[PDB]
Design a protein around this nucleic acid. Structure first.
Ligand SMILES: [K+]
Ligand SMILES: [K+]
Ligand SMILES: [K+]
Ligand SMILES: [K+]
Ligand SMILES: [Mg+2]
Ligand SMILES: [Mg+2]
Ligand SMILES: [Mg+2]
Ligand SMILES: [Mg+2]
Ligand SMILES: [Mg+2]
Ligand SMILES: [Mg+2]
Ligand SMILES: [Mg+2]
Ligand SMILES: [Mg+2]
Ligand SMILES: [Mg+2]
Ligand SMILES: [Mg+2]
Ligand SMILES: [Mg+2]
Ligand SMILES: [Mg+2]
Ligand code: NA
Lengths: 48, 77, 90, 55
RNA sequence: ACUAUAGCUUUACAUUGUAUUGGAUACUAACUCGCGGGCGAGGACACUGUAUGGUGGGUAGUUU
RNA sequence: GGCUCCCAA
RNA sequence: AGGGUUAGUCGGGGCCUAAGGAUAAGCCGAAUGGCGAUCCGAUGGAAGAACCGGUUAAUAUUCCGGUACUGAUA
RNA sequence: ACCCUUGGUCAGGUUGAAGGUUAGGUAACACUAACUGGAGGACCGAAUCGGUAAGCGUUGAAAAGCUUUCGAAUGAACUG
RNA sequence: GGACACGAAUCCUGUGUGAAUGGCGGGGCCCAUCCCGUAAGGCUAAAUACUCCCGAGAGACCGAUAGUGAACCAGU
RNA sequence: UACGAAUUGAUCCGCAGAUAUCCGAAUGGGGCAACCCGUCAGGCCCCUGACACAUGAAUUUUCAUGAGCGAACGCGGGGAACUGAAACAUCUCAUUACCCGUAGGAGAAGAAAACAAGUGAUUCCCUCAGUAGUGGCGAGCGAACGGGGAU
């Protein structure tokens, strides 16, 4: 049975990466909210 | 950003009011158009996006004076 | 000073007992072969023939405190196997 | 529209005079085609002065 | 079903002017389109703004 | 593989 | 806890473009913005260039010995 | 789910369309015979895609499965 | 059409018009008298609002399932 | 734990300096943030360290200014619905929530084409007053003049 999560690093960074968040105004809104909450990880670019 | 370059007029927000006083949001739009003008002082042709009220002011006080007044009022740019 | 420390290990001892013109250094991860070569010439007054490099990432480790557990990492480094000209040692 | 006349105009004479016309007839025809110019106060004063220097 | 409404559509004013025996014709200069990098075709119409009358389960809020 | 045939080219 | 992954020739990238994306000149639009041909963008095109034998507890067309090739530079 | 660009895959066996050649036959076509040929949302059947019927499972090995059976398998195919 | 306490005097304007130079405007529909003021140019402190932060203090506020989600490895 | 520094004045405290890798408005060009690839002037020597190389607005290519982030308070541009009216459409919720733009230490307002039936620019507090009004005259909403103060 195929499950919902099928990993792909290129797709992950294209969809949720730091540059894609910075591209639009609402992505920068998301980044500002996460910084205000104080999250240790800001985007999926942080994980390794 | 469709604004009359001579008068500065822009679209207004108002209501459609039915007979039963139902109120619906609406826009009053400017009677706006692009027109080509002969500028006599510089002997040139200038295309202006203006309203009919702006055209009335131009026909009243001349195109050069209207352009100068609009520039001093900040409408022209 | 890109060179951090020499490599003392069984593999390095075996390769030096075999060839005797080969020496292993641990250097900064961003130093390429030309600068590793010039640096070892400066630090030891020898002529260098060839350089082989490999990048190591740090090992992941488990720091143990009184209450629980923390996840940490060691620093990354670069290995540099250095071949001197036939006749010289370190 | 109030216009000083600059050249001769058919069906509307009075060269070098003050005349009223429809705004389109004069914004789209005369002023673009050189004859006539809008009679602002400065141009009215200059025209009156030229008339007094002629007379 | 009741009330609105996007859209479509009618007329008036503005954009919008000139002549002839008014409401028709004609004109070109506003305005629109094509070609080439001015020329051709239209033309005071068309288009758009304001107002107005129709149509409007396409859409919405409700009642029963 | 050239080559032959075909049309959906 | 200590050790272990070695490349001019292997793979990738550096070069090129597709869908698409971001934009220039311009266009549209209460604002935030939306369009719009050069650039980006592989899943495709181009890539210059070997090997037989040994060898570790753990690497090998990468280390060692023989046979070569390929590109710059003086 | 659908679409766009660019790649890949489909053991083996069967059947025998168009067409071609050589005979007869025609005024010429027509029209019969043999061989050849290898078409097809053609046939049987692995990989593969799907999910017909039955059995098992139902605090299951599994938040939809397994075994047997069954459909398609050069295409309106499957797949990265 | 909108804002004004106000669901059509005052103020604003999408659309179409359009003066005056003692004149004009206002006093809740409209006229006259009376009274008040002088539009279509601009600037201006104080008394007013708030606390990310720094310093000094306080509480008939809590005392580890309370008090901030977080007294500790906490936006972990 | 070692090993060192320190009365020739360490460590520590106050003020002033030096250095300050990479990403990020990121600004030499790209990019999958913390990476890849360059040009021109020099200096070393295929490779290195140190310069410069963005865009928009005043401006005359020399020059200053801006971009981004960030508590609340201010001003402005858009702007709901649940709810209440014991249903619901005018009305209410509310010129609220929310989105967007943009200042300052405060901002906005402010010196009568004013209120009134004598006062004399703004702002804020207490009253006037739940009054005058307004409203399917329902649910509700709700002033101003005057007086007392801060300034
Ligand atoms: K080597
Ligand atoms: K390597
Ligand atoms: K499969
Ligand atoms: K101020
Ligand atoms: Mg372990
Ligand atoms: Mg319905
Ligand atoms: Mg409702
Ligand atoms: Mg390219
Ligand atoms: Mg590829
Ligand atoms: Mg192995
Ligand atoms: Mg078949
Ligand atoms: Mg099968
Ligand atoms: Mg089959
Ligand atoms: Mg707690
Ligand atoms: Mg850039
Ligand atoms: Mg109700
Ligand atoms: Na850069």
């Amino acid at each position: 049975m195929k499950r919902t999560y099928q990993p792909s690093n290129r797709k992950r960074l294209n969809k949720h990466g730091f540059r894609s968040r910075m591209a639009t105004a609402n992505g920068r809104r998301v980044l500002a909210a996460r910084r205000a909450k104080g999250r240790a990880k800001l985007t999926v670019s942080d994980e390794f | 950003s469709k604004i009359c370059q001579i008068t500065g007029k822009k679209a207004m927000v108002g209501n459609n009011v039915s007979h039963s006083k139902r109120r619906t949001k609406r826009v009053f739009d400017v009677n706006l158009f692009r027109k080509k003008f002969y500028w006599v002082e510089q002997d040139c042709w200038v295309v202006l996006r203006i309203s009919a009220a702006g055209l009335r002011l131009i026909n009243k006080i001349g195109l050069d004076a209207a352009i100068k007044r609009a520039a001093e009022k900040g409408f022209l740019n | 000073g890109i060179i951090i420390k020499p490599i003392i290990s069984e593999k390095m001892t075996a390769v030096t007992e075999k060839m005797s013109e080969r020496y292993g250094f641990r250097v900064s991860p961003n130093a390429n072969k030309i600068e590793i070569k010039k640096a070892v010439e400066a630090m030891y007054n020898v002529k260098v023939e060839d350089v082989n490099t490999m990048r190591y990432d740090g090992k992941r480790k488990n720091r143990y405190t009184k209450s629980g557990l923390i996840r940490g990492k060691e620093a990354s480094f670069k290995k540099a196997i250095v071949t001197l000209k036939k006749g010289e040692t370190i | 529209m109030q216009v000083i006349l600059k050249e001769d105009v058919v069906n509307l004479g009075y060269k070098d005079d003050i005349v009223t016309v429809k705004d389109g007839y004069g914004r789209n025809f005369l002023i673009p085609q050189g004859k006539a110019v809008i009679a602002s106060e400065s141009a009215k004063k200059v025209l009156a002065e030229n008339l007094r220097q002629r007379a």
